[PDB]
Amino acid sequence: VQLVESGGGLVQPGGSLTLSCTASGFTLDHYDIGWFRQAPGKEREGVSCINNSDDDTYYADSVKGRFTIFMNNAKDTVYLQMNSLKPEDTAIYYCAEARGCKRGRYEYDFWGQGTQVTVSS
């Protein structure tokens, strides 16, 4: 599956965005999909992951509560709802298949160029 990102922008602190991770309109409900980001000066990190077969979701502590990862009934998009955005959330956001939503440091295939999110006053 070749996933790519959309939905970035520059927002003011306290605002929100909805990102989309898609694969050409194909359905995604078989896959486990992670949302990741790489902020300036930081390691690329996984922020949320969905295990679509098992109906599990995972969040980094830095985003829990504020972010949610989900599909809608079309099953063609893994959304990332990002609420209460802070300057520290500024990063390029990427999505990729993340089988099992494993914890640790793995390699992923990032087929998309990412989507820039800038949170700035």
């Binding site: 070749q2 992670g34 990741f36 790489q38 390691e43 690329r44 990190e45 996984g46 922020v47 949320s48 992951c49 995972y58 969040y59 980094a60 502590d61 829990k64 993340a98 939503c101 494993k102 914890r103 640790g104 440091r105 793995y106 390699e107 992923y108 295939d109 990032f110 087929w111």
Partner: peptide, 11 residues
């Protein structure tokens, strides 16, 4: 693809 590591400490 960009074949790249990332850290996942999600729960």
């Amino acid at each position: 693809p960009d074949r790249k590591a990332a850290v996942s400490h999600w729960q």
